[PDB]
Amino acid sequence: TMKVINDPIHGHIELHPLLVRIIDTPQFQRLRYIKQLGGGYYVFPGASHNRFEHSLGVGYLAGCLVHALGEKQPELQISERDVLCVQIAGLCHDLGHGPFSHMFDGRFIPLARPEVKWTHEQGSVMMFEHLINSNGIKPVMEQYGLIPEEDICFIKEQIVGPLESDSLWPYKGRPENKSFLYEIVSNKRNGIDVDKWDYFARDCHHLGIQNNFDYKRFIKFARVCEVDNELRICARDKEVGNLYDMFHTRNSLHRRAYQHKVGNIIDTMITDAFLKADDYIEITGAGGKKYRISTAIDDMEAYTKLTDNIFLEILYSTDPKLKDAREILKQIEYRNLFKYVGETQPTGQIKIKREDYESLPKEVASAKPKVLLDVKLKAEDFIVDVINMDKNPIDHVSFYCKTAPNRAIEQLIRVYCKKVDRKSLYAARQYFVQWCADRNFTKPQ
C-alpha cells in the first residue's frame, strides 16, 4: 500500500508498510505531544512542531540516502533489508525524548536525579524495545525480509552507538564492509547526519529563519569512498559551498533560537515547576506502579504517557500540593519571568557536568561579594543554566575527486534570578561576578 504523507519540507513521503506498523503505535505516536524546540514556542509562535513530524522526516531522508548510495555503487551490497533497517532507525532516533525535548534530558533529570545517567538516546532504544515487544513488530519484520535479532541490533546501534562498548570493529548489527551505514542517522564525527538535515530544514521553516543548504543536492552527489582505509560517506568536492551554507544555517539556528535568552529562561522556569511538582504528579506504569515525572524513565510503560501534557496537567490542577509549581506556569503566561543576571564561560576545556548541576546555584549563593550587599539571596532564588553547543568546519568532512570517485582528496553559563526587586537583582549580579571569579570563569560583561 505504500502510504503517502504530505510533509511541508519533503513533500510527498512514501512509507513502507513496516514503517507504518511501527508509526501507528502508542509508543510512537507519543512524539505528537512533545514539542521539538520545547520552550522555544513561547518565543517563536511558529515553533508549534513536534517530534513526530521530525522522526518521519528523518526516516524519509535516511532512506533517500541509503537508496541513492546503493543505486550509484552496486558494489557496496546495500540491500533493501539495509534500506528498511536504516529507515526504522532514523524513524526512532527521538523515540526516547521526554517532555519539551532537551529540557528533559539536559536540565530536568540532572536536577531531579543527579546520580542517574539518562539520555534521550538510551530512552530511544528502550522505547524501541517496548514498541516492538508491545505491538508484535518482530513477526512483521520477518515478513518484510528483516532478520529480527541482527536487525534490531543494527537499528539500536544506529541510534545509541556500540551497545557492548586501537582495537577492531565494535558494532555487531552489520559487518565492517557496511560501516558507512552507521553514519547516516547519527554521526557527530563529521557532524553531518540526516537527522540534522531534517531538523535544520524544519526548525528553519517553522521558526522563520532562512535555510541556505539543499539536502537534495548532497544526496545526489554523495558517494561512499575510502578514507584512512575505511568506507565513509563522502561527497563531491563541489558541494563544499553547500556544506559551508549548511554550517551557516546551523550557526544561525543556534544563535537566534536554541540559545535564546528568553526561550532558555522559560525552559528553566518550566523545569522549576516540574521539580516542584515531582513529588505529587503520578504517572501510572506497569502493574499500576505509580512512577513520577523524574522516575517514569524507569518504566517505559509510563514514559509512554509522559509528554508535554504534564505542563497543562500542572496548570489546570486543583491539588493544593501543586500550587507552588502551578504558579510558576501562571508566571510564564502573565510574562513575569525570571530576570537575566549574567553570562560567563568555563576556563580552558573545563565543562560543567550534569551530575553537578544542582550544586551550581548553591555555590552562587555561598559566594562572598566583596562589597557587602543589603539583601542576601539564597540558592532557591538562583537559577544556573548550562548551555552546550557542539573545530574548523569543512576540514573534517570528506570529499572525493570526480575523476576518481572511489578515493578521497563550548559551554555558556547563564545565571537568572527568581526575585525581581531592583535590589535583589543588584545582589544577584554581585554574587554572580564573584562566583565567576572564585571559580575562575570569564569576567561577566
Among 53, 94, 105, 239, binds Fe ion (CB under 5 A): 94
Among 52, 171, 182, 291, binds a second copy (CB under 8 A): 52
When the beta carbons of 11 and 241 are compared against a second copy, the nearer one is: 11
The item of Fe ion, a second copy, none sharing an interface with residue 94, based on CB under 5 to 8 Å by kind, is Fe ion
**Least distance from C-beta 335 to a second copy, angstroms?**
4
**241 makes contact with a second copy (CB under 8 A):** no
Q: Residue 125's Cα: distance from chain center in Å?
A: 14
User: How far, CA to CA in Å, does 292 sit from each of 106, 144, 276?
Assistant: 18, 38, 12
Nearest-5° Cα angle at 208, 57 to 198: 15
**Complex with Fe ion: residue 94 or 151, whichever CB lies closer:** 94
Amino acid at position 331, single letter: Q
Long-range contact pairs involving 436-444 (C-beta distance under 8 Å, separation at least 24): 436/342, 436/344, 438/367, 439/363, 440/347, 441/344, 441/345, 441/346, 441/347, 441/413, 442/344, 442/345, 442/347, 443/344, 444/342, 444/343, 444/344
- Is the CB of 134 or the CB of 345 nearer to a second copy? 134
**Is residue 339 part of the contact set for a second copy (CB under 8 A)?**
no
Interaction partner, residue 24 (Fe ion, a second copy, none; CB < 5-8 Å by kind): a second copy
Give me the DSSP letters along 322-333: GHHHHHHHHHHH
Cβ atoms of 84 and 18 closer than 8 Å? yes
- How far apart are CB 207 and a second copy at their closest, in Å? 7
Take residue 262 and report the three cell numbers written for it. Answer: 528568553
Question: What's the order of all strands across the beta sheet hosting 382-388?
Answer: 339-344, 411-417, 382-388
Annotated binding residue 102: yes
Annotated ligand binding at 195? The verdict is yes
CB-side exposure of 114: number of CA atoms within 13 Å? 10
Site for Fe ion in 188-227 (CB under 5 A): 195
What is the residue-wise DSSP string for 264-331?
A: HHHHHHHHHHHHHHTTT--EE-GGG-EE-TTTGGG-HHHHTT-STHHHHHHHT---GGGHHHHHHHHH
The verdict on whether residue 188 carries a ligand-binding annotation is no
Residue of 49, 120, 130, 206 marked active site: 120
* Number of residues binding to a second copy, judged by CB under 8 A: 40
Among 22, 53, 155, 185, binds a second copy (CB under 8 A): 53
205 is catalytic: no
Site for a second copy in 181-240 (CB under 8 A): 205-208
| 259 annotated binding-site participant | yes
Could you tell me how many residues make up the chain?
A: 445
- Which partner in Fe ion, a second copy, none is near 292 (CB below 5 to 8 A by kind)? none
Ligand-binding site membership of 37 (annotated): yes
Answer with the entry of Fe ion, a second copy, none that 215 interacts with (C-beta below 5 to 8 A by kind).
none
CA pair distance 445, 441, nearest whole angstrom = 12
Tell me how far apart the alpha carbons of residues 298 and 320 are, in angstroms, rounded to a whole number.
Answer: 27
Which one of 333, 374, 390, 395 is in contact with a second copy (CB under 8 A)? 333
Choose the binding region for a second copy from 25-33, 69-77, 231-239, 410-418 (rule: CB under 8 A): 25-33
Q: Which is nearer to Fe ion, 82 or 195 (CB)?
A: 195
Q: Using the rule CB under 8 A, is 327 a contact of a second copy?
A: no
Nearest-10 Cα torsion for 27, 28, 32, 37: 100
Report whether 429 belongs to an annotated binding site: no
195 binds, among Fe ion, a second copy, none (CB under 5 to 8 A by kind): Fe ion
Q: Angle at which helices 240-252 and 194-207 pack, to 10 degrees?
A: 50
Nearest CB to a second copy, comparing residues 315 and 373: 315
What is the rounded CA–CA span in Å between residue 253 and residue 44?
A: 12
DSSP string of 396-438, one letter each residue:
GS-EEBTTBTTB---EEEEEEES--SHHHHHHHHHHHHHHHHH
Q: Specify binding-site residues.
A: 3-4, 6, 24, 29, 32, 36-37, 43, 51, 54, 93-94, 97, 102, 195-196, 199, 203, 217, 236, 238, 242, 250, 256, 258-261, 335, 339, 402
Report the catalytic residues: 120
Point out which residues bind Fe ion (CB under 5 A). 94, 195
Point out which residues bind a second copy (CB under 8 A). 5-9, 11, 20, 24-26, 29, 32-33, 41, 44-46, 48-50, 52-53, 56, 205-208, 284, 305, 307, 309, 312-313, 315-316, 318, 330, 333-335
